[PDB]
Amino acid sequence: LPDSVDWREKGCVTEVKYQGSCGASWAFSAVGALEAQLKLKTGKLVSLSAQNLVDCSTEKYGNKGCNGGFMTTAFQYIIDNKGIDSDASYPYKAMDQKCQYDSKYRAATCSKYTELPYGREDVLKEAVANKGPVSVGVDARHPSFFLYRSGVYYEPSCTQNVNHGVLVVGYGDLNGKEYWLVKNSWGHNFGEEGYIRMARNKGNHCGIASFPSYPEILQ
Numbered sequence: 001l002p003d004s005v006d007w008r009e010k011g012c013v014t015e016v017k018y019q020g021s022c023g024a025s026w027a028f029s030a031v032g033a034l035e036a037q038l039k040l041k042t043g044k045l046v047s048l049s050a051q052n053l054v055d056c057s058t059e060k061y062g063n064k065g066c067n068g069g070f071m072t073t074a075f076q077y078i079i080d081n082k083g084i085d086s087d088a089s090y091p092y093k094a095m096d097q098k099c100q101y102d103s104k105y106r107a108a109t110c111s112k113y114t115e116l117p118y119g120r121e122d123v124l125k126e127a128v129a130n131k132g133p134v135s136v137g138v139d140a141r142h143p144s145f146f147l148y149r150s151g152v153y154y155e156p157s158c159t160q161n162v163n164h165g166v167l168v169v170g171y172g173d174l175n176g177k178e179y180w181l182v183k184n185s186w187g188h189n190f191g192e193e194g195y196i197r198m199a200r201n202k203g204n205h206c207g208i209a210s211f212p213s214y215p216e217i218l219q
């Protein structure tokens, strides 16, 4: 297994997004993970629609749009819906709306998804190295998280009760500190150009490896 990866370097990560007041971090984590698989499969990097997930992957998938939801069930919707629209065709509005999915603008598809075992940072590392970026949840309910600007994030009072969806797009070590490279959905002004490096191999720090999952686009 490699010592560092960074999927941005293989043009598999889209630009950082800005969720704003709507609690759709889950949807941004989901589309992030699938964007990468679409690139690998097709060579084309296209931002997929979070608003589509918010509007259409709803109570039938255990989701509540701007009030929260899960990546796993988002991935199921895309399997069930037999498609997801492009961001360009179904733009993010940071509010709940009627479902406006149109298969004419389908930009990707999803065949299956996998969940990783809880708390297994060795397994998460393997998946990130061998499969692509991985959707995870983190415990982001801490002032130090919102105020993070750079370096390797470590919060002594972090828990493994995750509440905020993000994308693991790499890992590495910086000056002795092992980290995971995490794309967030708070725009470019957050952290390191929209990214946060987070403590790795520090006992499932902030629950980063509590609920990982990733999609696959077959055939």
Ligand SMILES: Cn1c(=O)n(C2CCN(CCCn3nc(-c4ccc(C(F)(F)F)cc4)c4c3CCN(C(=O)c3cnc[nH]3)C4)CC2)c2ccccc21
Pocket (backbone or CB within 6 Å): 025, 026, 029, 059, 060, 061, 062, 063, 069, 070, 071, 073, 136, 137, 138, 160, 161, 162, 163, 164, 165, 166, 207, 210, 211
């Ligand atoms: C109607 N209907 C549902 O309801 N389902 C459920 C939706 C998700 N469930 C829970 C998954 C586990 N699970 N997933 C998160 C989770 C994942 C990601 C995020 C975020 F998006 F923010 F990233 C937030 C929470 C948390 C947990 C358990 C407790 N949690 C912890 O963090 C924790 C565990 N040990 C210490 N702490 C939160 C299982 C089924 C349905 C599934 C199919 C069809 C219809 C369905």
